[model samples]
Target: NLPGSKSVSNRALLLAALASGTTRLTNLLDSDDIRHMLNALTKLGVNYRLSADKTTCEVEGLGQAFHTTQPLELFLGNAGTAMRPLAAALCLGQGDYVLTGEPRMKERPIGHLVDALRQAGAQIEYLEQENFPPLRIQGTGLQAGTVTIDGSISSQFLTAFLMSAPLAQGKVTIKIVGELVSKPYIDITLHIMEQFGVQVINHDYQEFVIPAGQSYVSPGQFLVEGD
Candidate 1:
């Protein structure tokens, strides 16, 4: 038997939430991390239906950045995969959002991702400790430009940026700092990004370019492979 991937499940959820059409995801993993992501999407106003076993999901895409007038708070437990990408995606929306995770999540460093976002003109502040979770993000959207991030700790930082870069007002060029770990994970991010109809230009995994005016169109279905 093959087990589904937590990474693909979470990324597909976020992309489907932001895409322009409804998406049906099959073979999705049923786990605490996926549950955290599904719960967070619900709170953000994305409509979806889940199977009883939570192995299948149908998500109605918002077609644009989230437009909630009221501020929001998301408690992500300790799912760094959920927290990182969700934080990046929220930056392209229109609202005030604060993300708080479990205590261990609080100890995880999100500074690299936050720093890259700030450089791209995203308004994010550390609510509790610097370089950690419990962040307040003022969503004014991102302006495309050259931004660099250190990817030694986790590839999630780079993955987060890649998923959100296309939503910027112009082309976005990302420069990598230091050695990048989990190199294969970046490949997964790129694969999903392409399947959703966005193309990224890679330069030796050191730099990336996402063109402006690219919108995510649902391929109608997303298949979750074994991790």
Candidate 2:
């Protein structure tokens, strides 16, 4: 069963699912898509203690990754819901991880987000082209506080940056240097970052700031609210 909602789950589960408390996540959606997502999370470091019936389990969230991490193989499938957030999460994680998706994902555009990530100090390269996927990401940590990005197509690029900001060693300042169309998505991003226990400072919606000496603090009572 899928234990979280994409619309409401990314923030909750990404932070800490079972570690915060004895969380009983009832009403999880049962679907093949959910199992795939669970498998990917396990690969990323969320180890689970399974139940005897195979109907329930506990997700051990690794919290925020810190250190010279090893390379992880991630199969993102074709779910944009999974790949987008996983992209942001992997950037915060330590070391390099090879990301692959369904055939269609290889055709999706990624340079916009990749450029922003590089600006933030991620060493990402396309296995094919500049805007397409099949990425090999390797980097230590983000540098500089401010980065300007062009967000004409999708707001996910900015969302990835914003989510990565809280994990940055120093404060991160992001400026949208181009006309943004899916502004609502950006707002949703800001709100989700807040819920994940990040305190952000904004400047006229043009620049975003994560306070200096700040990092993601996993919730002790993390549990997803029903959709």
Candidate 3:
């Protein structure tokens, strides 16, 4: 094994960006996917320091959700992990954001996440085909409530929602519409959330509840474990 993991790298970048303070991460994977996420974060006004070899990163957390003064556009370069989680997180912030990836990314279905966010009062528009990518998200914020999402295609949809749940206005409950695939990946989401000082209540992998009033506090230091 190469002792590196793309899933961990991207997820760590996202969690660190949302946390309350600076997080120094070691054993990170320096790959194209992570570069895409890092680029987007930089564009979002996140401050980070990368080591010479690019294996370590120190990210200054936004503390609260991101708030930007101008409209922003992010190019994710086919990184599904970056595109999905960033889509969810950006809606909690204050700005207008358009998330587009590589050509192939436009074909990836994201309607499951979009429908769930819309039900929760997020203003998202499909910039291209319905149920697919190239999305324009008006960051009006998310309301706290129960929402249902289909989980047949990818668990990233669920992961995206779960990561942003703690920032909702009230308690957020997620109900799965179908059998959740890639169950272990959801486990990683929960684990990383816990490490960042947010806890999610999982019920048999079919439902999740993120209690309100809990925010992401920095762990100060994070170790990126190989997946």
TM-score of each: 0.95, 0.78, 0.94
Ranking by TM-score: 1, 3, 2
- Compare candidates 1 and 2 on lDDT and give the better one: 1
CA shift at 203, candidate 3, in angstroms? 1.9
Each candidate structure's count of clashing pairs: 0, 2, 0
lDDT of model 3 at residue 192?
Answer: 88
Candidate 1 residue spans exceeding 4 A from truth: 151-153, 178-180
Model 2 off-target regions past 4 Å? 1-7, 17-34, 48-59, 66-70, 151-153, 219-227
Q: Write the per-residue lDDT of candidate 1 for residues 50-97, one digit (tens) a residue.
A: 999788999999888777778988999998879999889899979899
**Better model by TM-score, 2 or 3?**
3
- Candidate 1 has which clashing residue pairs, if any? none
lDDT score at residue 188, model 3, on the 0-100 scale: 84
The candidate, 1 or 3, that scores higher on TM-score is: 1
Task: Score residue 31 of candidate 3 by CA lDDT.
Answer: 87
